[PDB]
Structure 1
């Protein structure tokens, strides 16, 4: 299976540089062009450029010519994009994507998961995680709600899974809210049967890559 796995979210002070990576697998790396696409949080999609790993050819959006440098390392099947002289408006999700025509005429099109780069002078901060326990005050007709509050982190993003991704039905992980302080908080919740609170275990798995924070919190009745 074709996979493109990008490096984790980062925060960077203005004037700095960052190099985002995109590791390809499941196909012959040199056989397809690698693209880079920007989407700032909440300017849509913009094409940065493309790099041909078979011959080193590049084509850039003129807008990004001074900003971005695309390279590859064919020995590790990895594409890179380096952004220099970072300013606040460089805050965006950056995607890598392998896209072009096969010789037969079918279009090959696969995308990485994206990498959020935040440009800020503010300090990175790891979250506090608080279970929201199922109780008689969070039941509704045989169902119990439970969750985790992920408080006071910077910058975005936080990701949350339940039971290492084995619990996805009925999960709602909410968009983050901006606190007065400039930090963020988010909540994730799930509804489950109230009947089996005694026999099932529910763990929220919280990741905040900028502070390399990985926390697993058991949420118990």
Structure 2
């Protein structure tokens, strides 16, 4: 609904650049400061400074002073922010959460009326670190070794593996199973590529032989997957 809420996604390696967009509705160019911010997966949010969309006046957070670019593209309705000198450590979520509007009778560039506390729709966005091991879909057999398979405590099938495109619909849920997926995460290994351990619950007979498969389509790589991973 709020057009000022964020849009788009990217992936880029160390020393690359990045981009963003929004739209002139709700907290539009006539209705707030376009106070962009970012957050890492491991952390709370931090400011990327402030923009006034018409005329395009700005302030930057000093932690990013040499790493940032801005745009008064209000004819395109877009506070089209950008970034430069990116790093693997720069890989983060990004958002366009608007300022709480002007609080007085006055008029102008009110860049003294905000901070951390953005008060309108963020919508979200992301820039992935392309320093990681870029690769296609894989579904590693999370189904157990001979000591752990064919018992009522077991689980079967496979999860997303070997690609920096680590997110996938794996979960031992490729239609050969369609429920009971243990949500064991697709966390990155040291190269940034997936190392998922998700598996689907089953009767103790299926837990020793069943044709379980993961829908492990590497999402940042766009390609589909359905790889089998049968116990024992």
TM-score interval for Structure 1 and Structure 2 normalised by the shorter chain: 0.5 to 0.7
Please tell me whether the aligned partners of residues 160 and 216 of structure 2 are also in contact (alpha carbons under 8 angstroms). Answer: no
By how many angstroms is 1:2 displaced?
A: 3.7
Question: Partner of 2:111 in structure 1?
Answer: none
Moved more, 28-37 or 128-137: 128-137
Question: Partner of 2:193 in structure 1?
Answer: 184
By how many angstroms is 1:69 displaced?
A: 0.8
Question: Partner of 1:172 in structure 2?
Answer: 184
| Structure 2: runs of 5 or more not aligned | 105-117, 207-211
Q: Which protein is richer in strand relative to its size? A: 1
Question: Partner of 1:51 in structure 2?
Answer: 51
TM-score of the two chains, using structure 1 as the length reference: 0.64
Instruction: Tell me the alpha carbon deviations over residues 128-185 of structure 1, each in whole angstroms, 9 at most, x when there is no partner.
Output: 40253768927636x844332311x34xx62223679x9797423232121xxx4633
Question: Partner of 1:109 in structure 2?
Answer: 120
Q: Distance in 1 between matches of 2:102 and 2:213?
A: 49
Please tell me whether the aligned partners of residues 32 and 98 of structure 1 are also in contact (alpha carbons under 8 angstroms). Answer: no
Question: Partner of 2:139 in structure 1?
Answer: 130
Map residues 19-58 of structure 1 onto 2, 5 A cutoff.
19-24=18-23, 27=26, 29-30=28-29, 31-40=31-40, 42=42, 44-58=44-58
Question: Partner of 2:13 in structure 1?
Answer: 12
Question: Partner of 1:92 in structure 2?
Answer: 91
Question: Partner of 2:73 in structure 1?
Answer: 73
Alignment RMSD (CA, Å): 4.4
| Structure 1: runs of 5 or more not aligned | none
By how many angstroms is 1:103 displaced?
A: 6.7
Please tell me whether the aligned partners of residues 132 and 149 of structure 1 are also in contact (alpha carbons under 8 angstroms). Answer: no
| 1:63 aligned counterpart, secondary structure | helix
By how many angstroms is 1:49 displaced?
A: 1.2
